[PDB]
Subunit: 345 residues, 2 copies
Amino acid sequence: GNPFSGRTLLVNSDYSSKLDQTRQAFLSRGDQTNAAKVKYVQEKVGTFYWISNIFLLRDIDVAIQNARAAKARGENPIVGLVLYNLPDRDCSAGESSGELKLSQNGLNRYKNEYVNPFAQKLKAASDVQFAVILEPDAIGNMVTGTSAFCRNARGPQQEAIGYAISQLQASHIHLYLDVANGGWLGWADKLEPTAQEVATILQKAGNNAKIRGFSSNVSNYNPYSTSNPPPYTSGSPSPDESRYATNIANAMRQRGLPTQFIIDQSRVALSGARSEWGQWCNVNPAGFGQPFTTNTNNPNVDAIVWVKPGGESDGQCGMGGAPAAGMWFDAYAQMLTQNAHDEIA
Amino acid sequence: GNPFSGRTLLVNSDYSSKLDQTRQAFLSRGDQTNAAKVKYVQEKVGTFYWISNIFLLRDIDVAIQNARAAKARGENPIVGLVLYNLPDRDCSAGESSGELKLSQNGLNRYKNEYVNPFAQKLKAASDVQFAVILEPDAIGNMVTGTSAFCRNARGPQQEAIGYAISQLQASHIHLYLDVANGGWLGWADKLEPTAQEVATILQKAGNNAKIRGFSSNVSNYNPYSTSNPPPYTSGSPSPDESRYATNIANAMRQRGLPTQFIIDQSRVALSGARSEWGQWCNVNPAGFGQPFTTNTNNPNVDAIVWVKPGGESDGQCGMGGAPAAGMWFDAYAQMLTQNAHDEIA
């Protein structure tokens, strides 16, 4: 069954605290309507916690503590975590986007100094339900990346992700392998290749290794369901994320693999924001998307979630004034609030 | 005594490895002249090692290994290390640029998880000489930082730096407290406020605590000595780093504090590279500056060193094609080579 059914996605306390700056900035201009929308996100919108380096393994203990505090106040939470520290991470850029590199004993450090401790903390926390998104966009780079750097990282990255899955096999841990977004892998010629990559990684994870399914649109901006997708989606069978999810599940079902998705809607672009589907860095204009829900109107979509913490920069690119990746970008957080989904108030 | 006297600044092996890409690029266009200049930097030009987070404490072991291997083939090295993990680091941007935040128990984590281990490794290696640059731009942010965020961090940051000085007192450890660059703190109305900050920090490190002096121009592009400084230096008594060093040393002397500088010349801006002195991101055109030497022609300047590794990006800014901070930017590395100081050949 769906692990989110009857649960609340836990609020990310780091994100919530950083959003206090946004609440305060709206208050300094007498903008009470937007200040209150920020406070709603602070208190009621669950977001995944990104464990983007080895130092941030301590945030797993913060999330656990918060999942015990919440369920003690009467709630029934599920903690979203992002496992994201692959050696030669985001190989498309030509060099790891993170601290581990394959040429610096990265595969071993990932297994032993990153995955092992991550898996240990989740296992000691048997009372807590976890949804873990595994390595955003690694599969996309594997399927389509043609540079030597990406071509050299592919094997070791499949071993690393298979290792991760093999170490996170418990009843309270629900694994969602990332599959990028409909604009990257949802084209007719990319669905089958994506499914093949999943089978290869699952073979490496072990015979009895399972995953619940996949994640998509993490840190991206595609709509979940629309009858008016952008013109750049012309020719694609996956013009929104609900359809992308159904198309991947269809390829997965034919191979006997998992079919379920969680779809990020932390940020959704307004019509016309991107001229090209591949644009990804601090896209504007955009707005906060629909907050966490199991009411998805798609049997292969377990839940709509927030994974990227909107307001954390994607890098010094896109919207002007953008700080380095992961740094707080208050004016962007303000824009997302101004254009926020109607549920937020 | 000047700690660099009769010593060679140790090559940074990680940086030298990354430069191989540059050497390969020049070779691939038949440019032997610049390929040879890259190899000159790879084998003969010392660069500091940046210990920019807790994960990178392992690079101190790397540097010490290299120092002991150098001394085994008859050399007399001095290892440059950059101690750079202050809580709420680079406060003027509004959020720590590093992993430690004051509101996340950052002061305690800085002492116990970063300074202590740093000190343990250097005090164990009593056979190695070290030049440690302490917290680049922290004093700059303390003197001119009037935002609420910096003002809130001031107290604890002074205690943090004093703590780092207090833990690194040894005859083989030579401390240089960073004082930004002449464009920031070299103005007339800024020299005393800078000396006052150093006096306050040294009091907090204690009565018996000492530093050898200061570092400047780290990651910047100001020339060491020129009779033709850029127009934007008009009205400044510190229009080159040699004059900045003398001005600070004179202010310190009158308060009876240390005076000695080490000045980065890893990258030097060429004519017209900047229209404003505060420009800092991947400034171009620029060249590799003068390699390490103690022939400084200035009593207040212990040595010209390379601290920032030229070719590592400052951020996704300044020059087309720039990657995120710390990512290798090979076209920039080729530029620094073609415009290198005449010693490099």
